[PDB]
Design a protein around this ligand. Structure first.
Ligand SMILES: C[N+](C)(C)[C@@H](Cc1c[nH]c(=S)[nH]1)C(=O)O
Length: 275
């Protein structure tokens, strides 16, 4: 009886798809609940509004994204990842009555990336160095990174950078930078494409980017109906290194492995999942 089915969605990319499947695997093993993973469901605003509306039940959301996009007005937060989690978790519960579980260990930050030869040619080590060459290089940014105060709007406001920006589909920006039609893109720090395409991440010297740790986001009402979801999904808390998540992304995004299988093998190897 009562085999309730949860909708777990992810933002664009292998990582949310991997994360969502880990949520499904954990949920189905340890609760009387099934789960459906919705890969590549949308961007932050869509996932967030889908959650509040009940179209989805869980998705992995990132701490700095809670503080910077989701919370309005955005609070001025530190760079301590734990403090940023607490503001996110308390802020989003007050604002929208969403429960935000404990963050995973790794950080997946927005990272301004250039090909390694571009960085050598133009002497680019930090984001500030782009001011030197903002009239020579072409940037390709996701639409969301463009519109985000911690994205390109913050490249303008904090760095003074007025880059020549073309808004890209997320999956195209990496092929553009590789083939040469753009020279700057908004990478995600754990993206396998960084290592695969000789992309060098420019250092965030003015510290525009907040901490970004992922954790399940969910209505508080769902957590009251199923309190076991907190214990169950929190076995991921403080776990998964950038190196581990990067390898998982390689497997799904580069090797074409199934995200469920990659998540499953990993949770099993970590002892987080039977067999
Ligand atoms: C984790 N991250 C890199 C800081 C972004 C990634 C992201 C934002 N929108 C989509 S789609 N992906 C986020 O989830 O906010």
């Amino acid at each position: 009886m009562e085999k309730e089915n949860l909708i777990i969605a992810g933002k664009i990319g292998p990582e949310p798809e991997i994360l969502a499947n880990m949520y499904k695997l954990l949920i189905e093993e340890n609760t009387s609940m099934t789960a459906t993973v919705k890969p590549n469901f949308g961007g932050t605003s869509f996932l967030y509004e889908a959650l509040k509306k009940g179209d989805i039940d869980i998705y992995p959301e990132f701490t700095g994204t809670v503080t910077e996009s989701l919370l309005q007005p955005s609070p001025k937060v530190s760079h301590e990842p734990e403090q940023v989690y607490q503001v996110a978790r308390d802020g989003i519960a007050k604002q929208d009555h969403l429960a935000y579980l404990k963050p995973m260990s790794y950080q997946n930050t927005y990272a301004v990336a250039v090909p390694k030869k571009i960085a050598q040619e133009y002497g680019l080590k930090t984001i500030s160095d782009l001011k030197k060459v903002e009239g020579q290089l072409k940037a390709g940014f996701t639409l969301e990174f463009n519109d985000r105060e911690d994205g390109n709007k913050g490249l303008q406001s904090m760095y003074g950078l007025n880059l020549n920006v073309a808004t890209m589909q997320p999956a195209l920006r990496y092929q553009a930078i590789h083939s040469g039609d753009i020279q700057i893109t908004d990478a995600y720090s754990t993206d396998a494409e960084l290592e695969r395409y000789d992309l060098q991440v420019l250092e965030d010297d003015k510290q525009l980017f907040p901490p970004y740790q992922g954790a399940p986001l969910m209505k508080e009402a769902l957590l009251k109906k199923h309190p076991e979801l907190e214990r169950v999904l929190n076995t991921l808390a403080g776990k998964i290194t950038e190196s581990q998540m990067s390898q998982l992304n390689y497997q799904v995004g580069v090797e074409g492995k199934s995200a469920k299988q990659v998540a499953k093998e990993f949770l099993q190897e970590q002892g987080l999942l039977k067999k």
